[PDB]
Structures are given as structure tokens and as C-alpha cells.
Design a protein around this nucleic acid. Structure first.
Ligand SMILES: [Zn+2]
Lengths: 95, 8, 86, 83, 93, 107, 98, 82, 93, 107
DNA sequence: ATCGGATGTATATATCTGACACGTGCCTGGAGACTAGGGAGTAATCCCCTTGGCGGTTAAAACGCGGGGGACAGCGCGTACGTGCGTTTAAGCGGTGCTAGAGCTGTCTACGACCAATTGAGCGGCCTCGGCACCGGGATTCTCGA
DNA sequence: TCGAGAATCCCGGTGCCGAGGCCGCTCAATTGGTCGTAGACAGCTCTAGCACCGCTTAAACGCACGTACGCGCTGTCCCCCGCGTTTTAACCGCCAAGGGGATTACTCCCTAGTCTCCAGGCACGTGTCAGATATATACATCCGAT
């Protein structure tokens, strides 16, 4: 049994050192087709244009969490919370 | 008296 | 042939997956209320990119959302994406 | 027994007993939600009725009547019992 | 010299919604320079869009995909409706 | 509506003479469709109509007849989807939207 | 003891006064003499159009105001009512400026 | 003449007035030099691009279009001067 | 049909600096996207700047004043040195 | 009949022909000058050098001989002026610069 | 501060793979030569506005000075986020079949450029008055020490 | 819970110039011609996107548990606010030189365009070798106990 919070730092370094995709493929490719249902019905997705959406959504969430974790740190704690995420989006302009 | 009014 | 309207695949962006995504973002402790907020954030990001991805295809009169149309949707919002061309 | 007259400038009123718009039907509450400024369009005064707070869906519209100077059935606590 | 601007054409629309009001010159230079932005923003996007599909004509179909991209939400649906209603009246008459 | 002055035929106020010139001496593409400047002048007139309507509304609600840039900021930023189109832009001489965050009020 | 205002109720007056007016908030001569300094480092002997100092002033004063709105949110988020330079340097860091 | 340190003309009330307009209530005294260190960074970029538009036109006067084009370029479009 | 790219001309400049390190497939598609991108930005800026002066020419002067806007600082000095080398050695030689 | 490529004649390795065509077919302006497409081809050639130099340097320290996207991400984001230039750009499959904040490390 | 214990993590070695470096054919786009021509350069003036300076008023900044409330550190508590473990359940794959749709060629047809000949909308220039700035008095009302 | 005092709201009066309305006066739009071609349309090969399958298993999931981190409450204090007096530099108007912007008038030379030539570069087939995996291992990092 490790100290709580040290498997985390052993897990931070592991993911930051590698480049594979962190969301599973099929639970994502289904989400894209669910959301593409609204704007057009029965679309096909040229199957590299879902990889073009993981790689642009994963790289958006990660750049958001780097901007969330700076806000949580700034509120003098080490735990991100949804009152941080909503701040980081409000400062960038997004919300 | 009973006439409605603004600002008096 | 078959007719399905999808329901609740946003629960595929899984609670461990938002954890791994957070790790690459360098965080140690994730409050349990994050996992229904990121899903809120991601579902808003995916809409605006697909709505521009579709609008490009639908102009070109197609039924396949090709990889260049996704890229032009990203290039328009000032997210440029570099491994898929042009 | 219903005073449907309003004041635009002190030597003319506006009557709403027989003619008028629905705007007569606004009640009174000395804790207000609406007020009526006197905005002129194209060179006569008009009595337009702005808002003070977010008014909900199917919420009641209120007003101060300002009967200056000498019975409030509003049933709200912090309000003068008379008018 | 003659240096054209949209001074009058903004005024002729002010007399159509609010026929009793006027406009200060400093807030006419804004409207003169608001339209010159939305012009170069719509004709911009409607010329990346006639070039991704290898056309070489800006039709009226690019200008409505360009408006359905830039203008957000309910300004999209209205400016499409008042778009097509004003090109139909052009061709018919 | 009329037969001269091509904006008259569509029944607009914004010119289609000036726009159709500016779509060819602006180098957007090679050949400008003859329908195209009409549709473009229809979108431009609609926005200039919508932003002058909410400007004028907020000018009578501040008792003044003519429109100064302080009204144009209030017309844009108080709107939900005209602020979003004009999100990054900055209107000169045009104040701020009055708001005070909640914890700054006394209690 | 005279009529002394409490600490805070001249802030919340100067807020509601300045938000309600449009005028320029940095005196024009200590701003014209600032632009001409910073423009020296790129070219010597630059005349400035009179409008194009106003045009600089109208965008800088709408940057900082848009920064202080974004700053003050961080203070409130940190359970404060005082903005400190560890708040400016977060709003700039999150927006991607430094 | 060549001058230095005009930035102390961006004076301590004229920082707090801007702060007031942006709706902030209490200002730490360390701000008033941090803001002069942000406003110099902003004005450096905008003038550096603006002189470059002037320099290109073989002109010696920074007209209002240049400042508007330098601001449009960095994504801070300015309505009001053309 | 043929689809063009800068796939070979990157490979030359790869071997010119680093004569032993090959490049991947995916990491060529990035360097193919990046060249197309900067070409859009530099010629974009040289287009909008040969229009503000009401000229009709992308001269070699405009690209020097398009690099001096996009490229931040250090690269701005080098890419004009590396630029004016080429246009000198083209005219004379 | 001694048709020397302009790419050679200037001293470049990027196709000055294929730039002079793309400066025209895209309709950037009316008259692409002849001095122009050289100057592009140099500037592009300079930048693609400078990112491939730092990429190669990242390939050695990772002890690999084929540049992968991860080395391209590491060549950009580690630099100060390129990472300023490719600011908003996402490089697909490139991952993230390794950094923890100093608060998160323990004692 | 030690230190042994565990244990994941980083360093070696085999080997197998399929992704890439590379020849081969070709083909279509780049080069070359030359033509006309308008667009840019290079003169020339011309006058507008920018700069500099000054003299006087005075609003605004600076400076000092109480003092209060907000930042800060501290400390206790309970809770919830993590770690682990054991269990499920889709992800992945990889393999097939299939068929809808993208891509492409070949067709021709409306249509946009283009130019000329015409002219009236729109822009600059010039009066000219009312809308707002500006100030005065007073009713209001907000705060805050009673 | 209150009068006192302060600032703000507001109404009315006077004044100025900036907005708006007119007026010649171009030149930019319209009109109505041809003229090539872009793009629409039909038709087609085929590929790649969807769909289904079985299987393997990694991975998610659920629960228990214990903790350490959030958080709330307290105390201290110092530093920011408010305000008064002094100080000064902004500003406003004024004057004057003149530099540089902006325009007109040439003029030539560089670029579009065109046509003929050919080889650079593109798709394609192909061997091989760097790299992924597979397997043991020497060691840093952590943790419990000392
Ligand atoms: Zn009541």
C-alpha cells in the first residue's frame, strides 16, 4: 500500500511521457455519431475523420486541465473542482 | 388623489 | 434497414478516462464532481466542431464527413490541426 | 370604483376606463417590480412601463401608483396597509 | 476626393426601424466600420469555401453557407431567410 | 419595386452596385456570381437593421434622440447573440456594461 | 467626529460611477508621451497622427479593463476581495499571453 | 530629445480608475507597477506592428489605419476609426 | 489523380542538416501541413498588405513585411537574412 | 535549352516554380511579382530547417533514428520562438511537454 | 537521519515485422523566349497638419495620516478521494461481406466577363437651426453614528 | 430601528455647433450587347464505410477502507482606504514654421500571356532494417520500521 497521492505522481509521469490516445476509440466514435445525428441524418464518417476528432478533443481537454490545475493551485489547494473549470473557461472567453 | 402618477 | 436513435453514449467518456486525461494535464486530485462537468465541456466542444464539419460537407453535397472537412472546422475556430493535411 | 387615469404632464391625464390598452390591468404593490417612465417618441409623451427585477413566467406584475398624498389588499408583509 | 462609405445606406435603415431618431457622427463611423468588418468576414469565409471545393465562382450558395458558419444561432436562421427572400425578388423581377 | 438601381429590384437599402464592385476588386475569387452581391447585401442590411434597432431602443430608454457609441455597446453586449458575433471586437468611446460581482456588494 | 464614510462605500460608488461613463481614463499627455517613447525603439523621428494616439489609447484602456474584469474573477475565486499580482499573472497565463 | 521613464505618467489613480471601471473593489499596492508592466508589453506589440505597416508604405507618420490594422492583426479589432 | 505535397522537399532539408535521421510517415504529414500553413499566413499577410496600399502586386518587398509581422522577433531577423540571400543570388546568378 | 530550375539558381531546395503557381492559383493578388516567390521559398526553407534541426536533436536524446510526431512536439514546445509561432496549433499524436507543478511534488 | 525491503522502472538482447527508403516508368507542369502594355517609379508641387512653444487656470495627483477590516496563518474535524482488490463487461481485432457513395469522365448550356454608351445616384461643400452640454434649485434618498 | 448629512436624481434655462438638409456635379452604375467556359448533369467503376461475427482480455466497475485534505473558525495585524492640504502638470487656447502627405504628370520596364520543349516528380513495386515486442535484470524510488 503506497501513500495516497504517490501512485498519482507515478501515473502523471507515465501518461505525460507517452502519446497514445486516452479515451477509448469505440465509445468515442459512437459519441460523434450521436452528436452528428442532430445536424444531418445518416451521415458517414470517413474513418480518419474521427481520429481527427479525438486528437483535437483530447488535446483540448488536456490544455483545459492544465488551465484548471493552475486555478485550483491558485485557490491554495491541490484538488480541481467544477468551480475551477468554470473559471478557466470564463477567462479564456469560452463561456 | 386617485389618479395614478409617476414621480410625485 | 435498422433504425436507432442513440441514447447516452456520453457515458462512454468514462470516469477512468477523464482521470487519464487529467493526468496528462498534470493534476493529482480530481473531485468527484468533475466527471459530470468535463462531459458537459466536451459535449459542447464536439457540437461546435461537428456543426462546422457538417456545414462544409453539406455544402459540397456529400454524405461522408471527410477528414479535411473536420480540419477546416478546427482551422476556423483557431484550433489548427496538423497531421491530417492542408 | 377603479381609478384608470394616469399622469403625463400635470395639466393632462390619460384615461383608460373605456378605451385603452391592456396596460391598465397592472395592479399595485409598494414593493415594486415595474415602473413607468415618461419617454417621448416623435414629439409627444408616451407612458412606457419598464421593469425592475427579473419577472418569472406567469408571475404577477406590480407597480407603485404614487397617490400623493392623501387600503392595500396586496397581502404582502413589508408594505404600508393603505395607499 | 471621393472616398466612399456606407454613411447614407446606414441612415436609410435608421429611418426604417426608428423613424424619429438620428445618429451622431462618431457612432456613424462605427457602423461604417462594422459593416466593412462583416463584409470582409463573410466574403472571406465565402472564398475559402469556393476554393476548398475547387470552384471558381462565388455563387449565392457560398454566401449562405458562409453565413450559416459565421453568424451564430438565430442570426444564422434569420439572415438566411432574409437572404433568400431578397435574391428571389431579384431574379423574378 | 422598381427596375433601375439593382438594389431597388430586390427592394433593399444597401447597395448592390457598391457590393458587386467590392467583390471583384477585393480578390475573393475569380468570378462573382450575379446573384451573390444581392444575398450579401441582404445579410448586411439585416445586421445593420438589427443593431440599429437595439441601439435606438436603448437611446429612448435614456431619453436621448440621437445615438452615440455608448448606446451601441449597450445594444451589443446586452444581447445574447450579437455579443457573440462581436465577441473579440472593441467599440471605441463605448463604456462598459454595468455589473458588480456579488461579493462586492455589502451584506 | 465628522461624517466619515466606511471603508468600501466609496469603492462601490466609484465603481458605479465609472462603469456608467465612457470617457478616457488616462490623461492624454502622459499617454502621448508614452507612445512616442515606445515608438522610438523601432524607428527614430516618427510623427503620430493625432487620431492614432487616440486610436492607441482606446484599445489599451479597453485591454486593461477587460483584464481587470478577468483579474477580479480570480480574486473572488480565491476567496478574497483584493487583487494582487498573483491574480494578474493568472489571468494572463490562462488566456495564453505569458 | 530622447526621453525615458514616461510610464510613471500612467499614474496610480489612473490605474485604479481603470480598475474601478472593471469592477474591482480593493487593490493591493503592488498592482500599480504590475499594470505598468503589462501595459508596456501590450503597447510594445501594437506599435511594433503598426510602425511596420507605416515603414512599408514608405511613410513617416503612423496613421490611424495602421493602429487599426495592427490591432485587427492580433485579434483585437477596433471599430471606430475606419 | 496525383495529389501534390512538399514530401520530397522536406526530405532534402532533412538530409541537409541531419544526414542520418530519416523521417516517419506521420511526421512527414505534419511537416507537410506546417509548410502549407505558413504559406497561407505569409501570403495571406502579403495579400492584405498589398491591398491596404492600393497596389496590385505581391512584390518581394511585401513578403519581407509579411515575415516581419508574423515571425516573432528572433526568427524575423534570420528569415529575412535567409530571404534576401535567395533573392540576391537569384537575380545576379 | 539550358533550363536551370529557379530552385537551383537561387540556391534553394524548395520549388520556386511550385510557389509561383500557388501564389497565383489561390488568388492572393493580381500580379505576383517575379522577385516574390523566391522570397517565400527561402523563408519556408528556413523554417522547415529550424524545426527539423531541433527535431533531429530530440531524436538523438531519445536514441532513435526516425523523427516521429513526438519529436516534432518536443522540438516546437521546448523552443521559445517557434512555440510562440505555432501557438494555437495542435500537433496530432504529439503528446505534452513533461512538467509537474512545484506544489504537487511532496517533501 | 539509517537502512534494508520491495518494487516498479530503466537498461540490455533476441527476433520478427511491416513500414520506409529506393529504383522504374512517365507525364504534365516548369522553363524559355517574346510579345504588348499598364502599373509602378520618379519626378514635380501644394498645402494640411504635426510639432513646438507659451501663457494662464486649476483639476487632479501626490503626500501624509488615522484605523479598520481583510489577508493570513493556525488548527481542528470529517469526509471523500484515493488505493487496492476482486469482478464483470464491452473494447479490440481480425475477418467477411456488402453496397452506397465518392470520384471521375463525358457530355453540353446557361452565364459571367467584357466592353461601350449612357446618366443619375451619391459625394463634397454650404448654410442653419434644435439637441444636448452646462448650470441652478430643490426634492429625493442612502448611509451611518445615533 | 432614526435624523443628519451627503451625494445623486431631476427639472428648467441658456447657449453652440454639430447634425441634417440642399445643391451642383461628376463617375460609377446600368443597359445591352457578344463570347468562352465553367459547372451542372448523367453515368460509371470500385472502395471504403458500415455491419456482423467470434474471441480474448484488458479494462472498467464496485466496494471496503483509511486518510489527508478541504474547510471552517479564530486571532492578529498591517496595509489599504478615506480624506485633507499642498503641488503641478494637464489642458486649453494661441502662433508659427514646414515637413511631409497627397496629387498630377510622365515613362519604361516588369509581368501577363502564349507557345514550344522536356524532365522533374509522382505512383508504383520492392528489399531491409529500424523498431516493437518478448524476456530477463540492475537499480532508484518509496515505505515501514529503526
Ligand atoms: Zn402591498
Amino acid at each position: 500500500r503506497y501513500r495516497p497521492g504517490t501512485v498519482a505522481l507515478r501515473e502523471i509521469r507515465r501518461y505525460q511521457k507517452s502519446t497514445e490516445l486516452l479515451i477509448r476509440k469505440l465509445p468515442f466514435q459512437r459519441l460523434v455519431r450521436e452528436i452528428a445525428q442532430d445536424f444531418k441524418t445518416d451521415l458517414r464518417f470517413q474513418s480518419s475523420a474521427v481520429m481527427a476528432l479525438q486528437e483535437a478533443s483530447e488535446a483540448y481537454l488536456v490544455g483545459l486541465f492544465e488551465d484548471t490545475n493552475l486555478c485550483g493551485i491558485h485557490a491554495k489547494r491541490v484538488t480541481i473542482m467544477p468551480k475551477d473549470i468554470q473559471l478557466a473557461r470564463r477567462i479564456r472567453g469560452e463561456r | 388623489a386617485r389618479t395614478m402618477q409617476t414621480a410625485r | 434497414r435498422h433504425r436507432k436513435v442513440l441514447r447516452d453514449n456520453i457515458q462512454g467518456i468514462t470516469k477512468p478516462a477523464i482521470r487519464r486525461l487529467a493526468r496528462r494535464g498534470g493534476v493529482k486530485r480530481i473531485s468527484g464532481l468533475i466527471y459530470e462537468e468535463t462531459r458537459g465541456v466536451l459535449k459542447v466542444f464536439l457540437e461546435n466542431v461537428i456543426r462546422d464539419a457538417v456545414t462544409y460537407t453539406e455544402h459540397a453535397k456529400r454524405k461522408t464527413v471527410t477528414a479535411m472537412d473536420v480540419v477546416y472546422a478546427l482551422k476556423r475556430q483557431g484550433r489548427t490541426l496538423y497531421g491530417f493535411g492542408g | 370604483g377603479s381609478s384608470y387615469l394616469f399622469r403625463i404632464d400635470e395639466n393632462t391625464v390619460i384615461d383608460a376606463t373605456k378605451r385603452g390598452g391592456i396596460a391598465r390591468f397592472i395592479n399595485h404593490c409598494c414593493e415594486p417590480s415595474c415602473t413607468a417612465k415618461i419617454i417621448k417618441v416623435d414629439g409627444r409623451k408616451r407612458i412606457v412601463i419598464y421593469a425592475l427585477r427579473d419577472i418569472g413566467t406567469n408571475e404577477e406584475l406590480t407597480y407603485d401608483y404614487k397617490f400623493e398624498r392623501e387600503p392595500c389588499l396586496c397581502g404582502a408583509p413589508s408594505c404600508k396597509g393603505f395607499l | 476626393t471621393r472616398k466612399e462609405s456606407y454613411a447614407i445606406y446606414v441612415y436609410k435603415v435608421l429611418k426604417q426601424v426608428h423613424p424619429d431618431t438620428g445618429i451622431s457622427s462618431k457612432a456613424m463611423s462605427i457602423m461604417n466600420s462594422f459593416v466593412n468588418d462583416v463584409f470582409e468576414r463573410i466574403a472571406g469565409e465565402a472564398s475559402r469555401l469556393a476554393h476548398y471545393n475547387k470552384r471558381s465562382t462565388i455563387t449565392s450558395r457560398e454566401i449562405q453557407t458562409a453565413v450559416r458558419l459565421l453568424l451564430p444561432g438565430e442570426l444564422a436562421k434569420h439572415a438566411v431567410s432574409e437572404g433568400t427572400k431578397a435574391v428571389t425578388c431579384y431574379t423574378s423581377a | 419595386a422598381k427596375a433601375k438601381t439593382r438594389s431597388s429590384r430586390a427592394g433593399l437599402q444597401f447597395p448592390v452596385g457598391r457590393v458587386h464592385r467590392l467583390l471583384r476588386k477585393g480578390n475573393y475569387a475569380e468570378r462573382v456570381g450575379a446573384g451573390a452581391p444581392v444575398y450579401l447585401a441582404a445579410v448586411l442590411e439585416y445586421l445593420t437593421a438589427e443593431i440599429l434597432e437595439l441601439a435606438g431602443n436603448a437611446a429612448r430608454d435614456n431619453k436621448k434622440t440621437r445615438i452615440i457609441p455608448r448606446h451601441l455597446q449597450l445594444a451589443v453586449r446586452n444581447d445574447e447573440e450579437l455579443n457573440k458575433l462581436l465577441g473579440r471586437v472593441t467599440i471605441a468611446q463605448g463604456g462598459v456594461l454595468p455589473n458588480i460581482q456579488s461579493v462586492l456588494l455589502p451584506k
